[PDB]
Amino acid sequence: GAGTPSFGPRHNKTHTICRRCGNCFHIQKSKCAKCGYPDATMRHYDWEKKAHRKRAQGSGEMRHLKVTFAKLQRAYA
Amino acid sequence: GHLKGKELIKKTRQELLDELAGLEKKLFELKGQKAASAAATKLTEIKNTRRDVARVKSILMVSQRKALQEKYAKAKLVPIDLRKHQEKSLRNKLAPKYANKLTAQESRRHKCLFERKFALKA
Amino acid sequence: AAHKTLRTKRILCKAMKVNRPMPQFIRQMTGVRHIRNPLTRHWRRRKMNI
Amino acid sequence: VKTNPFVSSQARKVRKSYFNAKKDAKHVAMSAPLSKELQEANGIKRLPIRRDDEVMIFSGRMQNRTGKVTAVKLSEMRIYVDTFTTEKINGQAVSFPVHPSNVVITKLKMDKARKNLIELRRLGRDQILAKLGH
RNA sequence: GUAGUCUGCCAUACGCAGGAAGACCCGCUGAACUGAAGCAUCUCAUUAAGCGGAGGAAAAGAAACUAACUAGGAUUCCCUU
RNA sequence: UAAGUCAGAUGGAAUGCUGCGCGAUUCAGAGUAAAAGCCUCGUAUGACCAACCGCAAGCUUACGAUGGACCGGGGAGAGUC
RNA sequence: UAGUGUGAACGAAAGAUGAAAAGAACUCUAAAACAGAGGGUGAAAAGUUCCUGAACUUGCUUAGGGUUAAGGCUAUUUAUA
RNA sequence: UAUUACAGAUCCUAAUUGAAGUAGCGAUUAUCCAGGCUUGUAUCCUGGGGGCUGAUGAGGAGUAGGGUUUCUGGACAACUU
RNA sequence: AAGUCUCUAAGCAAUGGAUGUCUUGGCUCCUCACACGAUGAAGAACGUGGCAUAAUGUGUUAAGUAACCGGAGUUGCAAACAUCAUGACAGGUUAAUCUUUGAAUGCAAAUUGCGCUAAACUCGAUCGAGAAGCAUGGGUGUGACAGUACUACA
């Protein structure tokens, strides 16, 4: 009843790709669960300090930001 | 063949633009024939002419900018392209003359009460 | 499908051109061995969830 | 014993810096003594090796042959040479890598930078031996 | 009618605000497990999580202050009390 | 930026084994076909020659600034304590 | 990262050929990039998640015990008490 | 000086036994004969019998979902009891 | 009273990855720094190398280009180029170029949807297109409109 037969009609999609996150954007509710789009501030909590540092700075390219670290090495050495 | 960035500075702007379009054409013909013929030697020629067409675009742009900065230099409210880069913090931090300027009370006493040198005898 | 959007179609493109064996010449260059392409899959076994 | 704090004396740190040095330091790390014919001529013991010049190895299978440098290798950290070849089981010669610090330089070819390096070290070696007083 | 002002709204010229990060710092809000061999005041704690906001440090700071003396003299921190 | 790729035997290779030299303001460390003060990078230590050598703020000789004493004065934060 | 869940989130295993690829030519049996056998490379196969290669389990060879489930202890002439 | 001695924790992780060549290889119409291709086919293809599905059909086509599963050529280490 | 069975031991193997030896990785303590962003950040997506899927560089100037500073091949194969310089490239800065996004900002968005513009710019042969503009909030200035709000002179 509640197992194999009722898995049959599972074809709709609750979550869809999110623009800011790119990852779980709720279609009916219209919010990215992972990042909180479209709230202007980006979603993180201090109870998920582990999961936050997967998203936060360092994970990506850091194109502008890595050259501003590299200046501060030269000035103090 | 390929050409140096030094000697392109001497040439005229319109001389570079006909040089550019002729140099960019031989890129397009080679991109046609790499499907058919393929193979070595051509694939270094397509590499060099991609590097050369950047060379011409680059020195045109610095020939523009050095000329075009001279027009707007020594004048109030310059364009955004020609402003220097800097940080956000350093722009909005006011210039150290204004921070450090003295009140008319304070400057007039600083006539006498400045941080004068002194010493002791042996 | 059909009736896919364009940015849906962009993902399905990238998901199939990335699906291939690793080239031979990297093992010859670096000399490392036993590197697999991580974004290999099979359509029937693992679904994308995108 | 070292006085300078900023240089490290741990073996982990030195090996990591050595293998992942910049390109200019690795060329200096790949170097060898001259033969005594060239020492009296140019006035230096030690020089870094290029693809121009030729070199002569004491001790080996390839014992006591001259031969020109086909290729320096800075990642692999060794020098390919002409003559220094074993054949495969197939009839095919393959050049065999050797580390330069085992090797003596028998002939040298000049470069503006190589002459400019030599005239520095000659003048340096005259000052230091006058200071020590030999 | 015109000529000043007052008040409101719209359009435009020029620089500013937002977002990231948040260990430390500033202002609010605010638990329970736990201990009391039970438990309700009390304790854990003016703590954790939550909301808001700064800097390379922040905040504090030049007496409506201590003292009772043979008198000290802004604020901050360490030792002791 | 010092001083043996020393000689002999063994070995695929010597930095080890036996014996004789030499350096040290450098026997921190690493690399090198095997354990290295003297094979290479270094380490040590002073000497060497280029680059700069300026930003604001205040000066600069007296009724100009500051202070003491004496004469004559005004006031000191309200829905706050 | 692989991978799981609609989702918030969750999250592994996996280092070492040799000094140097010198990474095994060519021949024979075979339908044959099956699998070996000759022959070679190297100091030594260490022969490709290849240094050393333990235990449990297994195979082959050699030697004994067996109606007492097997093992232990003591005693000797070693299969008995 | 200590992350210092293991047989047990329905201990943790990693590998491995007996049971065992045993249980079992289901559900779906039904297969048979001669040729082709091959080292090798009842199974891959051709031809001919005998059958099944029997218009809510293992027929022809689409939403949702899957995402190259479509098509041609070559391949059989693994998978399709 | 039979054994190729079963039990025990030794030697050579198969399986398995313990022990021992190695270490370009951690962990901690101390030092110095924090100068991210409308001049478009952090984060996401997709491009791009001769053989390149991930990651790393980088943005149709796309493993880079220009200038200054280093100064000779930083790796398998293939190809080209460069030597006392008209200067090799996996070197290091700074400046260009800077795709679709994102505070994201012309209005939207599970859409490559729907707009607007004085000149100049650039192709296009007066008139189209591209390029580049156009957000909200608040500050100072400038202008315009609204009012039986206050007031003077009619």
3-state secondary structure of B84: coil
Cα of first residue to Cα of last residue in chain B, in angstroms, is: 80
Q: Give the pair of three-digit tokens for residue D50.
A: 């290029």
3-state secondary structure of D9: coil
Judge contact between D67 and D84, C-beta under 8 A: yes
Residues 42-101 of D with CB under 7 A from strand F: 45-46, 56-61, 77, 98-99, 101
Q: How far apart are alpha carbons C38 and C6 in whole angstroms?
A: 25
Amino acid at position A75, single letter: A
Q: What does DSSP say about strands D54-57 and D66-73: parallel, antiparallel, or unpaired?
A: antiparallel
| Residue B14: count of CB within 10 angstroms of its CB | 8
Per the document, the length of chain C is: 50
Cβ neighbors of A26 (< 8 A, separation 6 or more) are A14, A15, A32, A33
Judge contact between D69 and D27, C-beta under 8 A: no
Measuring CA to CA, which residue among D14, D111, D4 is closest to residue D53? Answer: D111
Cβ neighbors of D44 (< 8 A, separation 6 or more) are D34, D118, D121, D122, D125
Numbered residues of chain C with Cβ closer than 8 Å to any chain A Cβ? 7, 11, 50
For D10 and I153, how far is CA from C1' in angstroms? Answer: 98
Q: Give the pair of three-digit tokens for residue B21.
A: 């379009």
Burial C31-42 (b: 16+ CB within 10 A, else e): eeeeeeeeeeee
Task: Label residue B108 exposed, middle or buried (CB < 10 Å: 0-12, 13-18, 19+).
Answer: exposed
Residue whose CA is minimally distant from F29 C1' = D9
What one-character DSSP code corresponds to residue B95?
P
Backbone φ, ψ for residue A35 (5° rounding): -115, -10
List the beta bridge partners of residue D105. Answer: D34, D55
Q: How far apart are alpha carbons B69 and B44 in whole angstroms?
A: 37
List the beta bridge partners of residue D107. Answer: D54
H/E segment holding residue B104: helix B104-110
3-state secondary structure of A12: coil
Q: How far apart are alpha carbons B8 and B24 in whole angstroms?
A: 16
Cα of first residue to Cα of last residue in chain C, in angstroms, is: 13
Does the C-beta of B83 come within 7 A of strand E? no
For A25 and I100, how far is CA from C1' in angstroms? Answer: 19
Experimental approach was cryo-EM
Q: How far apart are alpha carbons D82 and B31 in whole angstroms?
A: 40
Judge contact between B31 and B43, C-beta under 8 A: no
Q: What does this entry list as its resolution, in Å?
A: 3.2
Numbered residues of chain A with Cβ closer than 8 Å to any chain C Cβ? 17
H/E segment holding residue D55: strand D54-57
3-state secondary structure of C4: coil
A38: preceding bond cis by omega (within 30 degrees): yes
Cα Rg, chain B, nearest whole Å? 29
Q: What does DSSP say about strands D93-95 and D85-87: parallel, antiparallel, or unpaired?
A: antiparallel
